[PDB]
Swiss-Prot record, chain A:
Belongs to the Integrator subunit 10 family. The chain holds residues 1 to 284 of 710 of the full protein. It is found in: Nucleus. Component of the Integrator complex, composed of core subunits INTS1, INTS2, INTS3, INTS4, INTS5, INTS6, INTS7, INTS8, INTS9/RC74, INTS10, INTS11/CPSF3L, INTS12, INTS13, INTS14 and INTS15. The core complex associates with protein phosphatase 2A subunits PPP2CA and PPP2R1A, to form the Integrator-PP2A (INTAC) complex. INTS10 is part of the tail subcomplex, composed of INTS10, INTS13, INTS14 and INTS15. This is Integrator complex subunit 10. Component of the integrator complex, a multiprotein complex that terminates RNA polymerase II (Pol II) transcription in the promoter-proximal region of genes. It comes from the Eukaryota. It comes from Homo sapiens.
From Swiss-Prot, chain B:
Component of the integrator complex, a multiprotein complex that terminates RNA polymerase II (Pol II) transcription in the promoter-proximal region of genes. Belongs to the Integrator subunit 15 family. It comes from the Eukaryota. Component of the Integrator complex, composed of core subunits INTS1, INTS2, INTS3, INTS4, INTS5, INTS6, INTS7, INTS8, INTS9/RC74, INTS10, INTS11/CPSF3L, INTS12, INTS13, INTS14 and INTS15. The core complex associates with protein phosphatase 2A subunits PPP2CA and PPP2R1A, to form the Integrator-PP2A (INTAC) complex. INTS15 is part of the tail subcomplex, composed of INTS10, INTS13, INTS14 and INTS15. The lineage of its organism: Eukaryota, Metazoa, Chordata, Craniata, Vertebrata. Its main location: nucleus. This is Integrator complex subunit 15.
Curated annotation (Swiss-Prot), chain C:
One of its GO terms (cellular component) is integrator complex. It comes from Homo sapiens. The chain holds residues 28 to 408 of 1019 of the full protein. Its main location: nucleus. This is Integrator complex subunit 5. Keywords: Acetylation, Cytoplasm, Membrane, Nucleus, Phosphoprotein, Transmembrane, Transmembrane helix. Component of the integrator complex, a multiprotein complex that terminates RNA polymerase II (Pol II) transcription in the promoter-proximal region of genes. GO terms for biological process: regulation of transcription elongation by RNA polymerase II; RNA polymerase II transcription initiation surveillance; snRNA 3'-end processing; snRNA processing.
Length: 232, 360, 289
């Protein structure tokens, strides 16, 4: 008799007792884990039961366990995608579950989401969220996010410089990359920073909190790094 | 020595006891300063027996708990606690058990974590019969004499969590569910289940906090109540089917299930913990010699109860026991094999989970 | 803990003292004996005040508060509280009485003794259906200890509870006669014969039927009781003739007597002639014939 049939029988017996006894189902899953710890189905069932019970700690431990042990299962990626979409009661519970996951494990799962995304704007927004969550990741993702946005805008052939990529860069990516001291940049790129922020506010005001203030702050940061509106 | 005793005879009982106790404190402190392992000579024991109504008993208990609490050295408090209360094999052991019951009862009442940890070490250092008797007296005091007093016992769960572990151990030794009387009261179980559910390491405190001898003393309290708690949850349905109220039965099954799952979480963390102290596969905290009484008790209970009338309870007990053995092994809490599980359960009635665990 | 410890310290160092004792009784397991001992002093002081007033006031409320605390303990766990509380109560009433109908009237007149008897009788009523022996045997021992000053308590309880108190008192009297109090039994039964003569009659008949050293001396014990208690003798003479009528019973008596020496045979004959001379009030002619 193959072990797959025994594992399926154990999982079915655990499932049948979920509406009747939660402790018994968790105990059966623990037994199956003790017998065959290398099973994705049993541990995933335990994770699903813990998540449905809204137990943040146990569900986070199990999610970390299968994310380390079982990365090829599409269900794990679906769960991580749902968690990231919530990150961008159920939403708060998913955020708590993500927080229970270790910080390095959080960064690695967000990076694995980064490698699995196709659309440019969604990937840019999620990378920016990664930057905000882990400012230490702004060093080797912040700048690249900004250029990737700029070349995406250029490829799309935006007749008006007003578009989502440039706005995301100037308002979110640009402050993150200029405000990070660890990010070493040449003096030539501040010219493009000022050019894009300037196109931003001139094509915004002409036609949000303060485009003029953000542009002025970027210009001041550029000026200080190179080393009222009237006295100057 | 005798000069103090003559000076003690001219004093009243309370002052004589306090002079004895201060003299013992001074003597033990000096001996500990001189030697690392002191010797409890016949003199201190004789003085404690000679000099140490209910009113004066209450005063003596107060001022002695004052002495434990005011003692700044753990060694001195533990040693004097043992010397006073370690059963000496004399007629004063029954008094020892009674007076120790009163002492630790009121110490739990006022959360005397010094006396609590002292009683933990004493239970660690006491034969099973006196821990049984003391568990009897305390369980009475906190669960059946005055109802609702166990909440005062319950706060100890985390006050003196080491004392909590030794309490569950000696309490399991008494309330091993071998009899309806040795079924723990419902308040006691709700305490312990809440205790352990709140802290799986609560019963892992002593294992992680004591240099473990390769051999666990027998006839004493076992290192963990994991054996006792497993004995509890496992014989727990058969004892209540024997007792037969539907709601109380359902609540007992639920609290037993929670105790069992807490014990199992303890076990699956015990793989990591035994590995941490390099005792995984070396030291089986669940002694297989301490699961055999459990398994035999279960088989007898199934045999007498006319299995045609109690099939459900038999199946549940078999499933719980098989899971306990499997988790204890896979986590190294128990040291055994699968052929051992086969020969262990040859005489038992057929059960699917037990057959699967045995086959592997 | 802090409040409870201060409470215990105040208790160790009358109204406030007894209230603190009752709080500690309600809060701490090991200290119940000290609380009961302290309340013994309150009851004794109240009884002394009552006796001084009889010879010629803020403690009676303490008495009732102790009563209701111990009574709530009794309903809370009769199995765990009634025996301790009942034994303490009997000890306390016996101590108060040491330091029959006239004794009854005088002693229920004291509110402390009435309170103690009420508590102990409720201990019985909680334990009559399951196990009254713990209270009943303690009452018997206190009757032994404080006789005859405790005879009124036993007679009053037998008036309340005849079916078991009568049998227990009869067994105790038989034991006393065999080992050698018999006046105490005579008086208690005489007060009880005023209201429960039928129950005493049935218990004595069952005792004698079971009789046909304790069993051998049962007949001399009953003869001694009849000699010292003419009231029970009269209540028995109503059906003594009906009881002794079967020839089998007469034979059981003759060999039961025959197991006695003639120093006891002649003694039994003389006891019989005395009883027949001073026992029969209306059925003399039938027994004579």
């Amino acid at each position: 008799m193959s072990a797959q049939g025994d594992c399926e029988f154990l999982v079915q017996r655990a499932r049948e007792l979920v509406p009747q006894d939660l402790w018994a189902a968790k105990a059966w899953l623990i037994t199956a884990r003790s017998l065959y710890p290398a099973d994705f189905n049993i541990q995933y069932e335990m994770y699903t039961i813990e998540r449905n019970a809204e137990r943040t700690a146990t569900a986070g431990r199990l999610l970390y366990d299968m994310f380390v042990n079982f990365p090829d299962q599409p269900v794990v990626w679906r769960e991580i995608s749902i968690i990231t979409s919530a990150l961008r009661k159920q939403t708060q519970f998913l955020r708590s579950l993500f927080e229970t996951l270790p910080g390095r494990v959080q960064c690695e799962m967000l990076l694995k989401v980064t490698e699995q995304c196709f659309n440019t704007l969604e990937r840019s927004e999620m990378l920016l969220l990664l930057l905000r969550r882990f400012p230490e990741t702004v060093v080797q993702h912040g700048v690249g996010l900004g250029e990737a946005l700029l070349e995406a805008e250029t490829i799309e052939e935006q007749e008006s410089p007003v578009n989502c990529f440039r706005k995301l860069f100037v308002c979110d990516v640009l402050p993150l990359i200029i405000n990070n001291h660890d990010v070493r940049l040449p003096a030539n790129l501040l010219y493009k920073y000022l050019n894009k922020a300037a196109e931003f506010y001139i094509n915004y005001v002409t036609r949000i909190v303060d485009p003029w203030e953000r542009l002025f702050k970027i210009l001041n940061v550029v000026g200080m790094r190179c080393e009222s509106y009237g006295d100057i | 020595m005798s000069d103090i005793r003559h000076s003690l005879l001219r004093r009243d009982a309370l002052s004589a006891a306090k002079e004895v106790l201060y003299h013992l404190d001074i003597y033990f402190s000096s001996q500990l300063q001189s030697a690392p392992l002191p010797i409890v000579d016949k003199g201190p024991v004789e003085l404690l027996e000679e000099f140490v109504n209910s009113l004066q008993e209450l005063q003596l208990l107060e001022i002695m708990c004052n002495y434990f609490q005011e003692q700044t050295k753990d060694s001195v408090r533990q040693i004097i606690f043992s010397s006073l209360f370690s059963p000496q094999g004399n007629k004063a052991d029954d008094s020892r058990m009674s007076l120790l019951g009163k002492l630790v009862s009121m110490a739990v009442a006022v959360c005397r974590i010094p006396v609590l940890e002292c009683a933990a070490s004493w239970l660690q250092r006491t034969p099973v019969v006196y821990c049984v008797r003391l568990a009897k007296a305390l369980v009475d005091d906190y669960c059946c004499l005055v109802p609702g007093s166990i909440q005062t016992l319950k706060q100890i769960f985390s006050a003196s969590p080491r004392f909590c572990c030794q309490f569950i151990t000696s309490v399991t030794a008494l309330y091993d569910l071998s009899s309806d009387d040795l079924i723990p009261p419902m308040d006691l179980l709700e305490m312990i289940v809440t205790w352990i559910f709140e802290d799986p390491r609560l019963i892992l405190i002593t294992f992680l906090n004591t240099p473990i001898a390769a051999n666990l003393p027998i006839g004493f309290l076992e290192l963990t109540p994991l054996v006792g708690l497993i004995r509890w949850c496992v014989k727990a349905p058969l004892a209540y089917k024997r007792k037969k109220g539907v709601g109380m039965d359902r609540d007992s099954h639920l609290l037993y299930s929670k105790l069992h799952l807490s014990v199992l979480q303890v076990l699956m963390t015990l793989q990591l913990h035994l590995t941490e102290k390099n005792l995984y596969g070396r030291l089986g905290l669940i002694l297989f010699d301490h699961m055999v009484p459990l398994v035999e008790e279960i088989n007898r209970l199934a045999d007498e109860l006319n299995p045609l009338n109690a099939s459900q309870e038999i199946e549940l007990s078999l499933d719980r026991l098989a899971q306990a053995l499997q988790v204890a092994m896979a986590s190294g809490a128990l040291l055994c094999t699968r052929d051992d599980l086969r020969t262990l359960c040859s005489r038992l009635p057929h059960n699917n989970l037990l057959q699967l665990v045995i086959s592997g | 803990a802090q409040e409870l410890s201060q409470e215990i310290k105040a208790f160790l160092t009358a109204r406030e003292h007894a209230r603190c004792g009752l709080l500690l009784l309600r809060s701490l397991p090991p200290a119940r004996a000290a609380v009961l001992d302290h309340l013994r002093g309150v009851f004794d002081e109240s009884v002394r005040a009552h006796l001084a007033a009889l010879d010629e006031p803020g403690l009676e409320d303490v008495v009732q508060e102790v009563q209701q605390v111990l009574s709530e303990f009794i309903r809370a766990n009769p199995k765990a509280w009634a025996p301790v509380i009942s034994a303490w109560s009997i000890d306390l009433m016996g101590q108060l009485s040491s330091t029959l109908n006239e004794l009854l009237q005088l002693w229920m007149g004291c509110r402390a003794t009435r309170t103690l008897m009420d508590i102990y009788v409720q201990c019985l009523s909680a334990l009559i259906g399951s196990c009254p022996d713990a209270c009943v045997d303690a009452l018997l021992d206190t009757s032994v200890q404080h006789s005859p000053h405790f005879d009124w308590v036993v007679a009053h309880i037998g008036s309340s509870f005849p079916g078991t108190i009568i049998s227990r008192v009869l067994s105790c009297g038989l034991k006393d006669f065999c080992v050698h109090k018999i006046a105490s039994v005579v008086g208690i039964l005489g007060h009880l014969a005023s209201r429960h003569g039928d129950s005493i009659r049935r218990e004595l008949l069952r005792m004698f039927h079971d009789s046909l050293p304790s069993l051998q001396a049962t007949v001399p014990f009953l003869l001694q009781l009849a000699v010292m208690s003419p009231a029970l003798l009269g209540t028995v003479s109503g059906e003594l003739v009906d009881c002794l009528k079967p020839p089998a019973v007469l034979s059981q008596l003759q060999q039961h007597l025959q197991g006695f020496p003639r120093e006891e045979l002649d003694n039994m004959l003389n006891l019989a002639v005395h009883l027949v001379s001073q026992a029969s009030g209306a059925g003399a002619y039938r027994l004579l014939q």
